[PDB]
Amino acid sequence: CPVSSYNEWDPLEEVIVGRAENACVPPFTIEVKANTYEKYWPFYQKQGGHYFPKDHLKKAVAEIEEMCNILKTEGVTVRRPDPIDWSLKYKTPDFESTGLYSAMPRDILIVVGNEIIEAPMAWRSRFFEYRAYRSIIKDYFHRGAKWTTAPKPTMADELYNQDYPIHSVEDRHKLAAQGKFVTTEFEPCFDAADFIRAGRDIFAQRSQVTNYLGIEWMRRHLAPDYRVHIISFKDPNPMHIDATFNIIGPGIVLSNPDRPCHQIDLFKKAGWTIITPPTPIIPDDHPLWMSSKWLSMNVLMLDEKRVMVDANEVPIQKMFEKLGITTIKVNIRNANSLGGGFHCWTCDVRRRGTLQSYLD
Amino acid sequence: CPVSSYNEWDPLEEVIVGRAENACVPPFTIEVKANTYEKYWPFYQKQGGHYFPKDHLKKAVAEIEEMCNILKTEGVTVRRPDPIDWSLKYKTPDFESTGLYSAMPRDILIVVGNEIIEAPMAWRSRFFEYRAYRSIIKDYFHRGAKWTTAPKPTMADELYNQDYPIHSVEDRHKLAAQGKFVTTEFEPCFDAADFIRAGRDIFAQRSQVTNYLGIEWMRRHLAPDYRVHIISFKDPNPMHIDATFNIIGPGIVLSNPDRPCHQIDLFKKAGWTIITPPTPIIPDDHPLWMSSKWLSMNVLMLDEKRVMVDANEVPIQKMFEKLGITTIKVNIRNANSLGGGFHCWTCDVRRRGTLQSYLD
Ligand SMILES: CCC[C@H](N)C(=O)O
Numbered sequence: 151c152p153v154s155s156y157n158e159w160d161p162l163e164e165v166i167v168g169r170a171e172n173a174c175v176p177p178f179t180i181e182v183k184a185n186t187y188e189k190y191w192p193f194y195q196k197q198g199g200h201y202f203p204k205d206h207l208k209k210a211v212a213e214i215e216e217m218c219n220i221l222k223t224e225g226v227t228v229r230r231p232d233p234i235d236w237s238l239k240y241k242t243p244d245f246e247s248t249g250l251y252s253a254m255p256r257d258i259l260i261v262v263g264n265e266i267i268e269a270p271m272a273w274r275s276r277f278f279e280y281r282a283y284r285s286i287i288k289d290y291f292h293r294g295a296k297w298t299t300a301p302k303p304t305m306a307d308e309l310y311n312q313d314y315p316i317h318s319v320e321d322r323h324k325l326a327a328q329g330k331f332v333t334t335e336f337e338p339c340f341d342a343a344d345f346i347r348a349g350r351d352i353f354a355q356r357s358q359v360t361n362y363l364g365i366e367w368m369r370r371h372l373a374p375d376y377r378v379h380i381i382s383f384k385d386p387n388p389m390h391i392d393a394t395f396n397i398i399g400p401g402i403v404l405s406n407p408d409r410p411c412h413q414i415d416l417f418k419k420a421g422w423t424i425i426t427p428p429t430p431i432i433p434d435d436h437p438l439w440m441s442s443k444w445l446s447m448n449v450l451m452l453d454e455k456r457v458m459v460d461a462n463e464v465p466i467q468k469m470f471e472k473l474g475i476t477t478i479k480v481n482i483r484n485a486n487s488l489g490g491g492f493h494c495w496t497c498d499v500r501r502r503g504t505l506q507s508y509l510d
Numbered sequence: 511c512p513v514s515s516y517n518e519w520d521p522l523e524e525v526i527v528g529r530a531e532n533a534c535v536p537p538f539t540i541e542v543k544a545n546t547y548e549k550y551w552p553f554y555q556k557q558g559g560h561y562f563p564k565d566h567l568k569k570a571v572a573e574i575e576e577m578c579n580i581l582k583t584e585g586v587t588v589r590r591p592d593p594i595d596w597s598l599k600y601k602t603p604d605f606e607s608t609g610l611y612s613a614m615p616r617d618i619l620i621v622v623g624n625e626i627i628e629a630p631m632a633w634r635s636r637f638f639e640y641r642a643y644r645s646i647i648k649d650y651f652h653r654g655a656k657w658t659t660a661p662k663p664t665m666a667d668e669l670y671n672q673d674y675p676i677h678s679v680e681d682r683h684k685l686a687a688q689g690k691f692v693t694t695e696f697e698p699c700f701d702a703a704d705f706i707r708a709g710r711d712i713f714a715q716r717s718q719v720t721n722y723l724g725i726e727w728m729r730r731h732l733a734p735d736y737r738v739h740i741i742s743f744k745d746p747n748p749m750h751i752d753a754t755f756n757i758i759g760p761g762i763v764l765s766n767p768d769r770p771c772h773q774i775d776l777f778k779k780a781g782w783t784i785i786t787p788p789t790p791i792i793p794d795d796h797p798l799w800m801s802s803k804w805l806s807m808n809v810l811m812l813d814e815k816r817v818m819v820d821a822n823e824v825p826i827q828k829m830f831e832k833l834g835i836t837t838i839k840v841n842i843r844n845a846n847s848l849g850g851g852f853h854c855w856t857c858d859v860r861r862r863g864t865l866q867s868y869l870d
């Protein structure tokens with residue numbers, strides 16, 4: 151029973167850690183544009199289809215190897231996806247594209263109990279991302295784990311709002327208010343990172359890449375043992391929930407100050423502790439091609455009292471320390487450029503614990 | 511400027527390919543015994559001084575001719591050493607012996623920049639091996655290349671640990687742990703194949719045939735433009751590094767799973783990609799008189815994305831293909847019996863590229 155994880159904090163025993171090798175800038179299509187900060191459009195426009203800066207990839211490779219050494223030191227068994235050249239152009243009857251990477255296991259895999267679920271994805275450059283993880287998943291399957299792949303979308307034009315106000319407009323907030331994003335409700339789609347686990351309760355957010363159809367598929371697939379709840383935040387470009395509402399312990403959550411939860415009272419009524427982390431100190435000149443600066447709160451819990459946090463983000467380190475949580479500092483400044491922190495770069499396969507309710 | 515090669519992967523333009531003609535089983539002296547698997551001792555005991563099985567040599571001859579045809583097809587200029595009868599018994603004031611062959615150019619010649627260096631060797635049956643390559647080397651010299659011959663040893667008894675636990679003992683690992691092998695530090699000796707190039711950095715291994723004196727001679731001869739680093743692996747019978755740690759691209763290396771590098775962290779810290787190939791599928795009944803089964807990873811790169819790999823070794827072919835490296839399959843099953851794969855059977859004289867650092 152290699153697979154067994156019910157939440158984000160029980161004693162970590164096994165984890166999968168992504169790879170920065172052969173990562174490619176994704177073609178600049180509507181859904182990529184919707185996620186990209188104006189500051190990087192020219193980069194995407196000129197680099198699409200080519201590898202991310204190799205000198206940069208080399209620094210990320212080194213940073214992740216160290217993180218892996220540290221995880222092993224902390225007693226965690228580490229598995230890595232297979233190396234793949236993401237520049238291969240593939241063609242389905244609906245579209246043609248080059249790949250992205252297998253840097254973020256959290257984006258595509260989620261473990262609920264003894265079951266590993268592969269998310270369908272919503273980006274054309276991520277259609278075949280599951281190929282990097284099949285060697286690991288087949289091994290767990292041979293060893294007794296449940297293996298599920300949610301319905302893979304066609305990703306035909308109909309899935310995208312070709313006329314979304316990507317070009318900047320901010321009333322994306324207005325559409326967002328209506329739960330309307332770059333992805334339509336044409337077919338189910340979602341990134342696993344839009345779901346965060348707390349035992350019997352899983353919280354999901356409708357985002358640029360996760361539609362209500364996708365959430366309903368998860369809800370229906372997991373019922374009645376698990377309850378999937380939808381929550382929303384003030385955010386004009388949501389993609390993944392773990393840098394917005396990161397649950398770090400039973401009844402404790404890190405809420406991004408810039409992205410308040412519309413349903414925060416549900417948690418306050420449940421006796422939950424909402425902690426708002428201090429702002430990130432990452433320089434504005436450092437390239438974050440795929441995300442915001444909020445990767446600082448994208449921490450990974452080794453257990454309730456041990457957290458893997460960025461070495462450079464001292465303010466948030468102090469915060470954890472005042473709470474009695476031991477900080478294991480690792481530097482992943484260059485890996486952050488690819489779009490993720492510790493929670494994103496990993497997928498907890500096995501945590502020592504049982505299925506419980508923390509919402510009463 | 512016919513000669514110019516700084517690493518193992520730049521676009522190959524000219525190469526020297528060995529010959530299987532007139533190869534002789536070397537006399538069974540201490541240093542040969544140290545390299546030979548128990549399984550073949552009787553063969554060496556009865557065959558020493560005589561030609562390797564001619565029916566077998568004929569199949570190897572055919573295989574290498576095809577490999578040469580393929581190289582020419584791929585646009586590589588091929589040079590071949592002169593045919594020589596290796597059975598001639600020669601006598602120096604220190605010893606008497608018959609020769610081996612000129613099958614492996616990698617064993618005796620190494621190109622660093624515009625300079626071709628002839629290794630001194632450590633085997634008595636290989637003292638006069640350089641004679642097969644002089645016609646080629648003089649031509650390059652007449653055309654502007656630098657030509658260097660490292661100090662040729664006396665190969666007197668003092669060079670060999672006459673009481674090495676060859677007979678099987680495995681604590682060779684213990685001596686090996688101490689950097690102690692069948693060759694002493696009496697005088698400099700080395701096979702060029704114990705060095706592997708990565709631009710400004712050259713990695714060397716102290717082995718059964720390459721002593722620290724030999725490595726220091728190389729280090730001192732090449733400084734300050736090149737840095738020669740010593741690295742070690744878990745291996746009780748090392749002889750040549752290219753089937754243990756084969757560098758296939760800038761910051762990418764094939765590490766033999768059975769022979770881990772004690773200094774692997776230096777490479778992980780440099781952001782290098784360490785790939786461990788799958789195991790060889792060569793039948794145990796096929797004779798490999800001079801090496802292990804690991805010749806499968808002894809590949810030759812035509813460039814960063816084209817690799818010459820064995821036709822029979824499908825698992826490693828798949829590995830390269832998933833990495834986006836085009837596989838040029840050639841069968842050299844019988845040539846393997848002589849002790850080498852593609853990297854061993856050749857010596858890259860000219861690769862299109864410049865001197866660079868890949869270790870930062
Ligand atoms: C984990 C990344 C979360 C979000 N897409 C952000 O940029 O903050």
Ligand SMILES: CCC[C@H](N)C(=O)O
Binds near residue numbers: 751801808850851
């Ligand atoms: C190139 C041959 C390497 C080594 N002597 C072996 O037998 O693996």
